[PDB]
Design a protein around this ligand. Structure first.
Ligand SMILES: *Cc1c(COP(=O)(O)O)cnc(C)c1O
Ligand SMILES: *Cc1c(COP(=O)(O)O)cnc(C)c1O
Ligand SMILES: *Cc1c(COP(=O)(O)O)cnc(C)c1O
Ligand SMILES: *Cc1c(COP(=O)(O)O)cnc(C)c1O
Ligand SMILES: *Cc1c(COP(=O)(O)O)cnc(C)c1O
Ligand SMILES: *Cc1c(COP(=O)(O)O)cnc(C)c1O
Lengths: 298, 298, 298, 298, 298, 298
């Protein structure tokens, strides 16, 4: 929780940010959102890969044809505004584009506009978590677009994630409809074999993670070979290391899958190198060669 | 629109029925709903298959493990209350169970409770509509449960339905991932061949429609043979008649699929017999042998 | 061979029935055809299920949207004429609708007409044949419609059939993409287990055979239970009897599959009963309750 | 049209190149063909990748086991002869190997020979075309070989292409049975993301295009990264550029898919570079390092 | 254990029934087996559906082409002899046909014979068991025959069953590759909806259980409707009753699946009726109309 | 055959190496094994990639959770001992971990130990073999792990291999459930097209061959490009060269597939180069850069 939420261009008090119960998105999952992080760095509060996230927000809406009146730049300025207005230095930002109070028909009436909200609030990675392969599979290829970060998609992440927690594990790993590894409930999956980094392609129903992309680029900078390919379920038991990636989860090591220990049962050497290079970005140790750090105070 | 909405046991003015913008269901499609109709009949306002719908509401929540504090009977009484309080005789009822303002984590915290809302509002079938087979497929079997009427499911119905309308058709027909007929965007599909009634099973990713079930039971009463089996796409072009079924759509004839006329291009004889038997229920002509008509004033 | 071939409304001498090498159908498989049989009966030359075949010819053309100028009755009279003009009593008729000398573009230009020809010519059942399961699968559900009897479809029947011949068998049995039994290279497949008759549904990529349909109706008249269901490959080795059906093949018993003998290795009792009832139609022993025999001489 | 057509070793007048209506290929799609282009260049009339096309003609026939008595060299000489004898400088060549007047059985009798024809005739720019994703899928992997350019295969291209034109688009894009991008109705598909060229592998039911291969080699010469990988449907909406390739279509840019604009809605930068390099081959600007230009005069 | 084991026609002491460590079946899973039960009845020791099991033993060997020198009758006599010679009245019989000490090549040398063993030894109620849906799927249709009860098949049952026990459940339920219900780890699955009995067909990778078959026949005698059809995963949560069937497991009620209670959490009404009818066979209460009881003393 | 077999830590005479007929592995395929080769080299008897094979033995057991008391080094010393004790210089070693005389329940009781045996015995490459594509497919992805070399897996290799033999071929090539090339009955498959080496990934249900891995590393040393990708069935007819790899089979060229000759019908140039480099390891010509040769005499 925090004071003020950016709502359709206005800074509204947190308490007053309410929508009608007949809002389309509440009944039909017709919303698109993002997960962004603001880090306190050597150069002050900085939004990690800000433009990339807002670009994906637009891409997700594009796929479902949701009309978005704000440009990427407008959304970016609004985001910084909400962090400053709330006096935050370290936070989690949540942009949300949703179909509001329009008719009750599935197809919104022509000429409608979407409601936009940007809320920000203040904001394990060493011992490694225990994961299990879920009995639920992720969405098939040409059904509900897995490349779009839409609300309705999360019924799948709820099923996969809750099942793992009900059986005593920290996270669940979902396979696609073909029986290949897709990703965790809400984070991308990586494997390290003989010093090589492996990760499933988007065609394995894995969402194009921005943390995932950052890791791939950092790994190449470190001289580590990266192979984007379909992975079998057994590979999880044969891998030297395995870790998850996501904005909220950052880089989370996995020490065991289905009760089977992953090489030594602790954060591996390659996972360690990547973690250091990742966190080094906010200390100045890792040079920001790509322009991933967006200053809140511009 | 109407006055008053039943909200967690209280009759709230329509205008005051608001939820916070950080409600779980707005971001993750974590809601379950129903579509029910109240008809003005020979015995006054009557809710069609009231118990069946509330039972499915509970079943849908059960699958996702959403805690529901109200019993089927409590929900049924609440529903009648909202129709009476709003002085409605002919209406569309919308029960909605959703995860409200809890954390922002996908998995709701243990001990949480769901918010429940029941809104009601006042409420083609002769010439037949033109349909097209969509380029989007419905959810694969063990991914997102198609038997549950959940909010997140509707991203699929939006894609299928919007595509049909963008190309000039009234409704889209989706095939499953195997290439077999599933159903329309938001309604079940029926075919009539040589005086025989055909409809895809639930395993073709078709939601167990209550209108669908009613038609099957009425057809048997009329002495019409019903075959629940997987159907090929071509069968749509070879069928003598084809129609859709749903609470909102009732019994909608389809006169053409993909520009190909369906036997004579008008409402067929078998579709007609079923329509008459269906609407006869609210005139007294068709005996309510199953107890499908629930009086609002009990 | 024979004299005269009906070509676009005219009886042309067999040798003069030629078309240009640039005919669309020669390059793109854009043709639809039928297989019909004329039997010498107790009532003289009689075309078996004449109307049904011409109706399917029209249905196959309808699916591909090939314009057909002739009505079902016109085609039926032309067929009888070809049999009479050729002084045939027992023959195989081959109606063929094809896209002729139009452009070289895959999509024929608007306003084009198809060419139609009807050729007829004079026309292993006691012991049974040896069949093998092919390594090639039949067309997937929403690719090339298997319900339509089109020319291009036969590339598949060629692959399945030639492979069986090459290995010393009389016919090959194709499985669909799922690994279930579809049918023989160019004939439907039946199995008899505990006095029960089994056959794959059309959704197993099996063409809606007219001989297949006749067998199902005759079986029911004989009091034999018929189950139209998906069949596993192993079922071929467990079946008491197995036989193929088609216009050209009629009812052909299968005494072995993949070198494995089918219960006693001879024509089974149920296959025999069905054969007798089938051939009894042309002797008068079996009453033609359906009006399947169309007299040539009218 | 034009005068003369090479028919089984003889130059026959166009009007006289006729084949019997009972030719196998007319009824069973049993033919194999090629599409070749002759361009007027800085070195005169030149056949683009002549040997490559004739080699594929042989490969297609080999898969179906069609007997071809002519060698690659004989066919190449015949092709040049057709262009010279018809006084063509710029034209489209169509070699066709087909099963002619043999029996009516699906399996041609042992010892048969195929008929061979080679016809030639005189022969979506900077704005691009509008495409839509078809509701029809391309052939599954082990059904009808997608690597062979056979006549029967085109029933698929007809379904995909006609649907697109019926809805107002210029071309349709088909997905395979898995829901992944395969290719256009009769041309390969390319995508450009962040300066990288993407194209589906043959295993996505995409025919091994010779234009496709040329583009891949030219791209590498230009220093452009090429990734041959499975592509999701959503990628079409996220791509910076998208274009089709084929002998007839050459390099055709796609400005929109399903009504969604492809980055700026005009021919993209990378597409432009590749087009220039491609057409530069006929002006001498692009050095023919591989020997793709075969002079007619030799 | 017990004394004596029938080994290739000879009653050998239990301790002496040994085979070489280089026996084919130990390395390649090349064995076929059965599970039979001998019950103490009102007519003394009786082998339940004796001939049916021996017939399936032969059918399993036939599919893999394992040479069996003993006839069904010889095996049946041997079985009775094992029970008598070991003075057993209530026991579990295990016939095993396996490829013994032949070469080490996968394909046994022509002319080989299999070794046959028949061992017998002395032999989830009213509360039911807790089951979970496994993360492992059962064998795909045309891979390893699911209709054959072979040794190698059990690696699957081991994976499915062990996972369930590792998580605290009594049995695991496997889905096929399509995401539909197949069966339990080593027993068939039944569901009861509105007084109707449902069970997956063999094509859902479910082995043709002999107990399964018995239940279907008994159900029909009791006037209960039986529907053999593909079942979705969700159906387990919507069913009124669910139970497993197998020779060892007999009729075991399932009170919950994945932590979700199955209607009241106790043995259901229909399950009870079927259990009573089943066990009534051994008390004389249920007339043995089919001849399922084979007396040991004969 | 040979004298002595290492059995649970003791050198037992070959003839006395027996296990009870009730051993778990004989009934349920619950065993894991390896195939290792001892070559007579320029350095004397040498076990090829000894450590790698024992590591895979452990990995296969780990996937099934079979307890293994011996470490990799213990197993390696035992292996050398068996070769020495048997006075072998060139031989085939067969390590086998299996579940022995434990209960009859599929799930072995807690605290059980596995039995381990290591047997060794003394131990078409120039012309090439004739292969055919089998009608049986290899195990689907998430059914029975294809990465594990377990006994039960071989029911599949038996079906694929025996079918090829029965039709006069030397080996059968299996396709996966998708219709893509997987591998031979018990050996990995390679293809050579334009000087490029191709092989299916593990996700095509291909076991991670150790000979396969060696070939890939040798190819890279020779400067040959290696592409690990999914391959279509047709690619076998279009390839310039095709060969199989395995411990027993080493590098076996394939001169024809399905009666279709593979480029010239003899051992190809690239296959030759790889063979020479492979066998050169035991002559000293090829430097053992990886430490693949483990000396017996240490
Ligand atoms: C958001 C999300 C991710 C993580 O993406 P990041 O851009 O790295 O935050 C991974 N998987 C799913 C299903 C997601 O929704
Ligand atoms: C609600 C719904 C239907 C119609 O069900 P009825 O119970 O008949 O109203 C059909 N299909 C889908 C996808 C639905 O959500
Ligand atoms: C024509 C055909 C059949 C047989 O159908 P009939 O109408 O009974 O002749 C079976 N399979 C295929 C693929 C066919 O084309
Ligand atoms: C011929 C063809 C192409 C084009 O390949 P080019 O050799 O480049 O002309 C593409 N797709 C299909 C289906 C084709 O038949
Ligand atoms: C043996 C077996 C069954 C049980 O069948 P019954 O003949 O009734 O004992 C069920 N499933 C599997 C996988 C089996 O092996
Ligand atoms: C053992 C095996 C191979 C060959 O692997 P190598 O380690 O090289 O001997 C190939 N396929 C299968 C199915 C195998 O079991």
């Amino acid at each position: 929780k925090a004071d003020y939420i950016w709502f359709n261009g206005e800074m509204v008090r947190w308490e007053d940010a309410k929508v009608h119960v007949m809002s389309h998105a509440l009944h039909y999952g017709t919303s698109v959102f993002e997960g962004i992080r603001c880090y306190d760095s050597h150069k002050g509060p900085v939004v990690f890969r800000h433009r990339e996230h807002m670009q994906r927000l637009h891409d997700s809406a594009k796929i479902y044809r949701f009309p978005v009146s704000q440009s990427i730049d407008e959304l970016m300025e609004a985001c910084r505004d909400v962090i400053r207005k709330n006096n935050l230095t370290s936070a989690y930002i949540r942009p949300l584009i949703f179909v509001g109070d329009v008719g009750m028909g599935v197809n919104p009436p022509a000429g409608y506009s979407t409601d936009v909200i940007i809320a920000a609030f203040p904001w394990a990675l060493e011992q490694g978590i225990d994961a299990m392969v879920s009995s639920w599979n992720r969405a098939a290829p040409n059904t509900i677009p897995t490349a779009a970060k839409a609300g309705g998609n999360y019924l799948s992440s709820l099923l996969v994630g809750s099942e793992a927690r009900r059986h005593g594990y920290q996270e669940g790993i979902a396979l696609d409809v073909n029986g290949y590894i897709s990703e965790g409930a809400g984070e991308n999956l990586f494997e390290v074999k003989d010093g090589v980094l492996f990760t499933p392609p988007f065609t394995s129903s894995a969402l194009p993670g921005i943390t995932r992309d950052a890791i791939i680029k950092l790994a190449k900078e470190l001289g580590i070979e990266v192979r984007e390919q379909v992975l079998s379920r057994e590979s999880l038991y044969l891998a030297d290391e395995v870790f998850m990636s996501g904005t909220a989860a950052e880089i989370t090591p996995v020490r065991s899958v289905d009760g089977i220990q992953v090489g030594e049962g602790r954060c591996g050497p390659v996972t360690k190198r990547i973690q250091q290079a990742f966190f080094g970005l906010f200390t100045g140790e890792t040079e920001d060669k790509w322009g991933w750090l967006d200053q809140v105070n511009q």
